Design a protein around this nucleic acid. Structure first.
Ligand code: ZN
Length: 118
DNA sequence: CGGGATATCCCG
DNA sequence: CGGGATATCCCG
């Protein structure tokens, strides 16, 4: 349990184009402002709220296919391009930098997330 | 032999 | 409009 805070880094129309590099993409600032100070019971809820926010933000929603926006409307993470999957983890994941500190959270591809941790 | 993740199941 | 309980991913 905890409240989200942070809010940072502006985003463009190639938001997740590089999710597979380095630390990935950051929490869009537009999204962070929508989630800041909100109350979440588990990180899973946050993740569920986060993806819903991405589906209601027009500038971001258009960077995804019809299928992916449907996923995000109900809180599921959008699928990554096939080249970025890792076994059965096939959707963008949220990485933490070592829990609702949105400036410490970033979006990365399964494949890239694996390497970062090892 | 533990740590970091997403997703579904289902609410009398 | 939620979220607890539970399943299952993938790492050496
Ligand atoms: Zn991570």
């Amino acid at each position: 349990p905890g409240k989200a805070t942070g809010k940072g880094k502006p985003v463009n129309n190639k938001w997740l184009n590089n999710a597979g590099k380095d630390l990935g993409s950051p929490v869009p600032d537009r999204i962070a402002n929508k989630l800041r100070d909100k109350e979440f019971k588990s990180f899973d809820d946050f993740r569920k709220k986060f993806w819903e926010e991405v589906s209601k933000d027009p500038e971001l929603s258009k960077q995804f296919s019809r299928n992916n926006n449907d996923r995000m409307k109900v809180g599921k993470a959008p699928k990554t391009r096939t080249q970025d999957v890792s076994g059965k983890r096939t959707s963008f994941e949220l990485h933490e930098e070592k829990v609702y500190d949105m400036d410490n959270i970033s979006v990365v591809t399964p494949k890239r997330h694996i390497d970062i941790h090892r």
